[PDB]
Amino acid sequence: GEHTTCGCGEHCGCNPCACGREGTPSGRANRRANCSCGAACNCASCGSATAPG
Ligand SMILES: [Zn+2]
Ligand SMILES: [Zn+2]
Ligand SMILES: [Zn+2]
Ligand SMILES: [Zn+2]
């Protein structure tokens, strides 16, 4: 059915899957350059956008 997806309900690098897709990573903020997400993302692995980690 589904795939490993960010809990916000969207493929993101923070959820590796057999397809490893994360969507177009908007390089417009301090994210892993693999976080395409935007909308309602309570995933801790995506909130992380502070300090070099
Ligand atoms: Zn996938
Ligand atoms: Zn994300
Ligand atoms: Zn997300
Ligand atoms: Zn996430």
Side-chain angles (χ1 to χ4, degrees):
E2 202 164 80
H3 232 213
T4 308
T5 52
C6 192
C8 68
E10 152 185 83
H11 265 80
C12 184
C14 71
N15 271 88
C17 49
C19 95
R21 194 198 193 192
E22 67 259 85
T24 302
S26 304
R28 290 279 168 158
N30 314 284
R31 324 187 183 139
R32 216 174 175 258
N34 314 134
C35 185
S36 177
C37 287
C41 202
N42 299 355
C43 159
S45 328
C46 287
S48 45
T50 180

Coordinates of all heavy atoms in Angstrom, one line a residue:
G1 N 0.8 -1.2 0.0 CA 0.0 0.0 0.0 C 0.9 1.2 0.0 O 1.4 1.6 -1.0
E2 N 1.0 1.9 1.2 CA 1.7 3.1 1.4 C 3.3 2.9 1.4 O 3.7 1.9 0.8 CB 1.3 3.6 2.8 CG 1.5 5.1 3.1 CD 0.7 5.6 4.3 OE1 1.1 5.4 5.4 OE2 -0.3 6.2 4.0
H3 N 4.1 3.8 1.9 CA 5.5 3.7 1.9 C 6.0 4.4 3.2 O 5.2 4.9 4.0 CB 6.1 4.4 0.7 CG 7.1 3.6 0.0 ND1 8.2 4.0 -0.7 CD2 7.0 2.2 -0.2 CE1 8.8 2.9 -1.3 NE2 8.1 1.8 -1.0
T4 N 7.3 4.3 3.5 CA 7.8 5.0 4.7 C 7.7 6.5 4.3 O 8.3 6.9 3.3 CB 9.1 4.5 5.1 OG1 9.0 3.0 5.2 CG2 9.6 4.9 6.5
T5 N 6.9 7.3 5.0 CA 6.6 8.7 4.8 C 6.7 9.4 6.1 O 6.4 8.9 7.2 CB 5.2 8.8 4.3 OG1 4.3 8.2 5.1 CG2 5.1 8.3 2.8
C6 N 7.0 10.7 6.1 CA 7.0 11.6 7.2 C 5.6 11.5 7.8 O 4.7 11.8 7.0 CB 7.4 13.0 6.8 SG 7.8 14.3 7.9
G7 N 5.5 11.4 9.1 CA 4.2 11.4 9.8 C 3.2 12.5 9.4 O 2.0 12.3 9.5
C8 N 3.7 13.6 8.8 CA 2.8 14.7 8.4 C 2.0 14.2 7.2 O 1.1 14.9 6.8 CB 3.6 15.9 8.1 SG 4.8 15.9 6.7
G9 N 2.3 13.0 6.7 CA 1.7 12.2 5.6 C 2.4 12.6 4.3 O 1.7 13.0 3.3
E10 N 3.7 12.6 4.2 CA 4.5 13.0 3.0 C 5.9 12.5 3.0 O 6.6 12.5 4.0 CB 4.5 14.5 3.2 CG 5.7 15.3 2.6 CD 5.5 16.7 3.0 OE1 6.0 16.9 4.1 OE2 5.0 17.6 2.2
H11 N 6.3 11.9 1.8 CA 7.6 11.4 1.6 C 8.6 12.5 2.0 O 8.4 13.7 1.6 CB 7.7 11.0 0.1 CG 7.4 9.5 -0.1 ND1 6.2 8.9 -0.2 CD2 8.3 8.6 -0.4 CE1 6.4 7.6 -0.5 NE2 7.7 7.4 -0.6
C12 N 9.6 12.2 2.8 CA 10.6 13.1 3.2 C 11.9 12.3 3.5 O 11.8 11.1 3.9 CB 10.2 13.9 4.5 SG 11.4 15.1 5.0
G13 N 13.1 12.9 3.4 CA 14.3 12.2 3.6 C 14.5 11.6 5.0 O 15.2 10.6 5.2
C14 N 13.7 12.1 5.9 CA 13.6 11.7 7.3 C 12.9 10.4 7.5 O 12.6 10.0 8.6 CB 13.0 12.8 8.1 SG 11.3 13.0 7.8
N15 N 12.4 9.8 6.4 CA 11.7 8.5 6.3 C 12.2 7.7 5.1 O 11.6 7.8 4.0 CB 10.2 8.8 6.2 CG 9.6 8.9 7.6 OD1 9.6 10.0 8.1 ND2 9.0 7.8 8.1
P16 N 13.3 7.0 5.2 CA 13.9 6.2 4.1 C 12.9 5.1 3.8 O 12.3 4.5 4.7 CB 15.3 5.8 4.7 CG 15.1 5.7 6.2 CD 14.1 6.8 6.4
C17 N 12.8 4.8 2.5 CA 11.9 3.8 2.0 C 12.6 3.1 0.8 O 13.6 3.7 0.3 CB 10.7 4.5 1.5 SG 10.8 6.0 0.4
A18 N 12.0 2.1 0.3 CA 12.6 1.4 -0.9 C 12.7 2.3 -2.1 O 13.2 1.8 -3.2 CB 11.7 0.2 -1.2
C19 N 12.1 3.5 -2.1 CA 12.2 4.4 -3.2 C 13.0 5.7 -2.8 O 13.2 6.5 -3.7 CB 10.8 4.7 -3.8 SG 9.8 6.1 -3.1
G20 N 13.3 5.8 -1.5 CA 14.1 6.9 -0.9 C 13.8 8.3 -1.3 O 14.5 9.3 -0.9
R21 N 12.6 8.5 -1.9 CA 12.1 9.8 -2.3 C 11.8 10.7 -1.1 O 11.2 10.2 -0.2 CB 10.9 9.6 -3.3 CG 10.5 10.8 -4.1 CD 9.1 10.7 -4.6 NE 8.8 11.8 -5.6 CZ 7.7 12.1 -6.2 NH1 6.6 11.4 -5.8 NH2 7.6 13.1 -7.0
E22 N 12.0 12.0 -1.3 CA 11.7 13.0 -0.3 C 11.0 14.3 -0.8 O 10.5 15.1 0.0 CB 13.0 13.5 0.4 CG 14.0 14.2 -0.6 CD 15.1 13.3 -1.1 OE1 14.9 12.6 -2.1 OE2 16.2 13.3 -0.4
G23 N 10.8 14.4 -2.1 CA 10.2 15.4 -2.9 C 11.2 16.6 -3.2 O 12.3 16.5 -2.6
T24 N 10.9 17.6 -3.9 CA 11.8 18.7 -4.2 C 12.2 19.4 -2.9 O 11.3 20.1 -2.3 CB 11.0 19.6 -5.2 OG1 10.7 18.9 -6.4 CG2 11.9 20.9 -5.6
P25 N 13.4 19.3 -2.5 CA 13.9 19.9 -1.2 C 14.1 21.4 -1.4 O 15.2 21.8 -1.8 CB 15.1 19.2 -0.9 CG 15.7 18.7 -2.2 CD 14.5 18.6 -3.1
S26 N 13.2 22.3 -1.0 CA 13.3 23.7 -1.1 C 14.4 24.2 -0.2 O 14.3 24.3 1.0 CB 11.9 24.4 -0.8 OG 10.9 23.9 -1.6
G27 N 15.6 24.5 -0.8 CA 16.8 25.0 -0.2 C 16.6 26.5 0.1 O 17.3 27.3 -0.4
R28 N 15.6 26.8 1.0 CA 15.3 28.2 1.4 C 15.3 28.4 2.9 O 14.8 29.4 3.4 CB 13.9 28.5 0.8 CG 13.9 28.7 -0.8 CD 14.4 30.0 -1.2 NE 14.7 30.1 -2.6 CZ 14.8 31.1 -3.4 NH1 14.6 32.4 -3.0 NH2 15.1 31.0 -4.7
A29 N 15.8 27.4 3.7 CA 15.9 27.4 5.1 C 16.9 26.4 5.5 O 17.3 25.5 4.7 CB 14.5 27.1 5.7
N30 N 17.3 26.5 6.8 CA 18.3 25.6 7.4 C 17.9 24.2 7.6 O 17.9 23.6 8.7 CB 18.7 26.3 8.8 CG 19.0 27.8 8.7 OD1 20.0 28.2 8.3 ND2 18.1 28.6 9.2
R31 N 17.5 23.5 6.5 CA 17.0 22.1 6.6 C 18.1 21.2 5.9 O 19.0 21.7 5.3 CB 15.6 21.9 5.9 CG 14.7 23.1 6.1 CD 13.3 22.8 5.6 NE 12.4 24.0 5.8 CZ 11.5 24.5 5.0 NH1 11.1 23.8 3.9 NH2 11.0 25.6 5.3
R32 N 18.0 19.9 6.0 CA 19.0 18.9 5.5 C 19.2 18.9 3.9 O 19.7 17.9 3.4 CB 18.5 17.5 5.9 CG 19.7 16.6 6.2 CD 19.2 15.3 6.8 NE 20.2 14.3 7.1 CZ 20.5 13.2 6.3 NH1 20.0 13.1 5.1 NH2 21.3 12.3 6.8
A33 N 18.6 19.8 3.2 CA 18.6 19.9 1.8 C 17.9 18.6 1.2 O 18.0 18.4 0.0 CB 20.0 20.1 1.2
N34 N 17.1 17.9 2.0 CA 16.4 16.7 1.7 C 15.0 16.9 2.3 O 14.2 15.9 2.3 CB 17.0 15.4 2.3 CG 18.5 15.3 2.1 OD1 19.2 14.9 3.1 ND2 19.1 15.5 0.9
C35 N 14.6 18.0 2.9 CA 13.2 18.2 3.4 C 12.3 19.1 2.5 O 12.2 20.3 2.8 CB 13.3 18.7 4.8 SG 11.8 18.9 5.7
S36 N 11.6 18.4 1.6 CA 10.6 19.1 0.7 C 9.4 19.6 1.4 O 8.7 20.5 1.0 CB 10.2 18.0 -0.3 OG 9.2 18.5 -1.2
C37 N 9.1 19.0 2.6 CA 8.0 19.3 3.5 C 7.7 20.8 3.6 O 8.7 21.6 3.6 CB 8.3 18.9 4.9 SG 8.3 17.1 5.5
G38 N 6.5 21.2 4.1 CA 6.3 22.6 4.3 C 5.2 22.7 5.3 O 5.4 23.0 6.4
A39 N 4.0 22.2 4.9 CA 2.8 22.2 5.7 C 3.0 21.3 6.9 O 4.0 20.5 7.0 CB 1.6 21.7 4.9
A40 N 2.1 21.5 7.9 CA 1.9 21.0 9.2 C 2.8 19.8 9.6 O 2.4 18.7 9.8 CB 0.4 20.6 9.3
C41 N 4.1 20.1 9.8 CA 5.1 19.1 10.1 C 5.6 19.0 11.5 O 6.7 19.4 11.9 CB 6.3 19.3 9.2 SG 7.2 17.7 9.0
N42 N 4.8 18.3 12.4 CA 5.2 18.1 13.8 C 6.3 17.1 13.9 O 6.8 16.9 15.1 CB 4.0 17.8 14.6 CG 3.0 19.0 14.6 OD1 3.2 20.0 14.0 ND2 1.8 18.8 15.2
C43 N 6.8 16.4 12.9 CA 7.9 15.5 13.0 C 9.2 16.1 13.6 O 9.7 17.0 12.9 CB 8.3 15.0 11.6 SG 9.9 14.3 11.2
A44 N 9.7 15.7 14.7 CA 10.8 16.2 15.4 C 12.0 16.2 14.4 O 12.7 17.3 14.3 CB 11.2 15.3 16.6
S45 N 12.2 15.2 13.6 CA 13.3 15.1 12.6 C 13.3 16.2 11.6 O 14.2 16.3 10.7 CB 13.3 13.8 11.9 OG 12.8 12.7 12.8
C46 N 12.1 16.9 11.4 CA 12.0 18.0 10.5 C 12.0 19.3 11.3 O 12.3 20.3 10.6 CB 10.7 17.9 9.7 SG 10.6 16.6 8.4
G47 N 11.5 19.4 12.5 CA 11.5 20.6 13.3 C 13.0 21.1 13.4 O 13.2 22.3 13.4
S48 N 13.9 20.2 13.5 CA 15.3 20.4 13.6 C 15.8 21.2 12.4 O 15.8 20.8 11.3 CB 16.0 19.0 13.7 OG 15.5 18.1 12.7
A49 N 16.1 22.5 12.7 CA 16.5 23.5 11.8 C 17.3 24.6 12.6 O 17.2 25.8 12.2 CB 15.3 24.1 11.0
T50 N 17.9 24.2 13.7 CA 18.6 25.1 14.6 C 19.9 24.4 14.9 O 20.0 23.2 15.1 CB 17.7 25.3 15.9 OG1 18.4 26.1 16.8 CG2 17.3 24.0 16.6
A51 N 21.0 25.2 14.8 CA 22.4 24.7 15.0 C 22.8 23.8 13.8 O 22.0 23.3 13.0 CB 22.6 24.2 16.4
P52 N 24.1 23.5 13.7 CA 24.7 22.6 12.7 C 24.4 21.1 13.0 O 25.3 20.3 13.2 CB 26.1 23.0 12.6 CG 26.5 23.3 14.1 CD 25.2 23.9 14.6
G53 N 23.1 20.7 13.0 CA 22.7 19.3 13.3 C 21.3 19.2 13.0 O 20.5 20.2 13.2
Ligands
ZN1 ZN 8.9 5.9 -1.0
ZN2 ZN 10.5 17.0 6.2
ZN3 ZN 7.0 16.4 7.2
ZN4 ZN 9.9 14.5 8.8

